[PDB]
């Protein structure tokens, strides 16, 4: 419901995940990991009826008003600076689905794996990396769709409207 807390500033730290001597050593934490939009993360809902038809719904609130948050990059006038913000967050979703993030998040728990193996109960197309990549083309396309719901500073340039999702 809240769109954003305080923006980029020196508050990144390590004691949020203390005893960080888990893989190499202690690391700071970006705001993107601290604040990010999700709807079904508790084991309350746990599983879902058919599929994950609502991550696109979640990211619709990610930048339509979440990144808008008061046109902060309009007065800042650096739209490309906003572009990199979604670029980082979109790449974050790459790691979240693939079980790559290092945080001890609720989403980091089995809830990511538990859903994907349920839909792959018979191991039909176990390409959970590729199907997410398959979904990426539409996942990114709807990502800027809510950006147009923000104030109409729409630019149809391919750089700001078509990222090479194949590479990362």
């Amino acid at each position: 419901k809240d769109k954003t807390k305080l923006d980029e500033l020196d508050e990144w730290n390590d004691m949020d995940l203390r005893g960080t001597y888990n893989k190499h050593k202690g690391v700071l934490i970006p705001p993107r990991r601290r604040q990010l939009c999700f709807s079904r993360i508790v084991r309350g809902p746990a599983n879902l009826r058919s599929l994950n038809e609502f991550k696109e719904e979640i990211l619709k609130g990610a930048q339509s008003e979440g990144k808008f948050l008061g046109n902060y990059y309009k007065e800042h006038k650096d739209k490309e600076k906003a572009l990199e913000a979604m670029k980082n967050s979109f790449y974050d979703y790459e790691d979240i689905i693939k079980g790559t993030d290092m945080l001890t998040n609720i989403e980091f728990k089995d809830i990511k794996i538990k859903l994907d193996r349920l839909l792959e109960k018979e191991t039909n197309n176990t390409k959970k990396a590729e199907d997410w990549w398959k979904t990426n083309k539409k996942s990114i396309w709807n990502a800027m769709l809510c950006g147009y719901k923000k104030s109409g500073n729409k630019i149809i340039d391919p750089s700001w409207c078509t990222i090479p999702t194949t590479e990362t």
Partner: protein, 224 residues
């Protein structure tokens, strides 16, 4: 040289509408021509015992004697003798068997319990429990009925009769069925049926749906 005499069961009688009974002869030499037959107290002759079991690989013979008698005679309590005579058993073994005449009868009582609230909140599957209690004697039958269609037997699990310590001769039994969460959210019929001898029509059933125990929430009243 074991000789079993399997008596007809209430569930088998209900499923078959017959009174099939059998006499099994096991742990004998692999030699045919076994004198196996069924007789009444008057020694009446029964029809042929077809499908004689082939000698098992464990060197134990198996002979089956099948008999078909009307339900009343078995319910009459008269003992029926399985005549068994073999080369290894020259003495004719007797298997006088009859229903346990002289047992009290009590009306079973049935309940259906909706699935646990937080289990439904967890949203994977729902479990329905059909409970039966306070019946005598044992050997009752249970089944599940869904919107007019029977279900496969393996989809539900039934318990066994068990004497509770409070009631002297009564019993109780359980039945567990599992369905998907959303289909029970639709929640159409899911009725449970029980058969026992003490019933006036030997059949009873109960129903339960998605919104059965939900109480009213708005005691709205208006006046002018």
């Amino acid at each position: 040289i074991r000789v079993f005499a399997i008596p007809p069961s209430f569930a088998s009688i209900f499923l078959t509408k017959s009174t099939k009974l059998t006499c099994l002869v096991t742990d004998l030499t692999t030699y045919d021509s076994v004198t196996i037959s069924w007789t009444r107290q008057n020694g009446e002759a029964v029809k042929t015992h077809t499908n004689i079991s082939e000698s098992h690989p464990n060197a134990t013979f198996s002979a089956v004697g099948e008999a078909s008698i009307c339900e009343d005679d078995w319910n009459s309590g008269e003992r029926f003798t399985c005549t068994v005579t073999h080369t290894d058993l020259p003495s004719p073994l007797k298997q006088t068997i009859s229903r346990p005449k002289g047992v009290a009868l009590h009306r079973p009582d049935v309940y259906l319990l909706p699935p646990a609230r937080e289990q439904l909140n967890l949203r994977e599957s729902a479990t329905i429990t059909c409970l039966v209690t306070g019946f005598s004697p044992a050997d009752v039958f249970v089944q599940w009925m869904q919107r007019g269609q029977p279900l496969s037997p393996e989809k539900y699990v039934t318990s066994a009769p068990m004497p509770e310590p409070q009631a002297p001769g009564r019993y109780f039994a359980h039945s567990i069925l599992t369905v998907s969460e959303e289909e029970w959210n639709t929640g159409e019929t899911y009725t449970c049926v029980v058969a026992h001898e003490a019933l006036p029509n030997r059949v009873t059933e109960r129903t339960v749906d998605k919104s059965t125990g939900k109480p009213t929430l708005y005691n709205v009243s208006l006046v002018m």
